[PDB]
Amino acid sequence: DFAELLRPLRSLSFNQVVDRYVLIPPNHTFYRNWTYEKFLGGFGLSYLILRELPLRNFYARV
Amino acid sequence: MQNTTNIVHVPVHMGHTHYFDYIDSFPKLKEGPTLEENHITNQKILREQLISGQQGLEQNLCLRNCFKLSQKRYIEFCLDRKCGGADFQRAATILGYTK
């Protein structure tokens, strides 16, 4: 399993390793925090649908 | 020791105004040329440097970059390899580092 962590490194040379995983081209235009916005914002969207539950009893929805 | 204690090495003058505490002036403060006068002065220098100070610049830039190295043995290696075999004391005179 320790040799399985280095599988993608054996097929590559050192120059290919650096150009692949180290020298990632700079691109600072992405919306990285969209991952947190969709997850945490989903609580609010879930409440919109959850507030319309056809549960008859008010205290059941409580 | 008071927490808001400062030791200043230049003279300051404090304003004697109610409800406020600040430095209202500095003794013997001389106002120089304005931002526009400095701009016109700097443009005269940059214009001369653009017109008559660009010939043979690549050699001087290489000598200046070699002298920013950490050790002297690396500076000499830089002068010999990059600057066409220049001498340490001779290049330091061109750059103005010699007394």
Binding site: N33, Y36, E37, L40, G41, G44 | -
Partner: protein, 50 residues
């Protein structure tokens, strides 16, 4: 450190790296709360329906 650094001091290096998440929906929640506070101000003092 010898030429351009200061004294070598011992500190505790915090591995936890906090960062306030800059979100969009948090301002929606904030506006809703202030909308409730302002409506209560109107409900108590500027409601003439009775």
């Amino acid at each position: 450190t010898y030429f351009y650094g200061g004294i070598l001091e011992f500190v505790y290096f915090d591995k936890s790296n906090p960062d306030m998440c800059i979100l969009v929906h948090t301002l929606w929640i904030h506006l809703l709360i202030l909308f409730l506070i302002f409506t209560g101000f109107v409900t108590i003092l500027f409601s003439f329906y009775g």
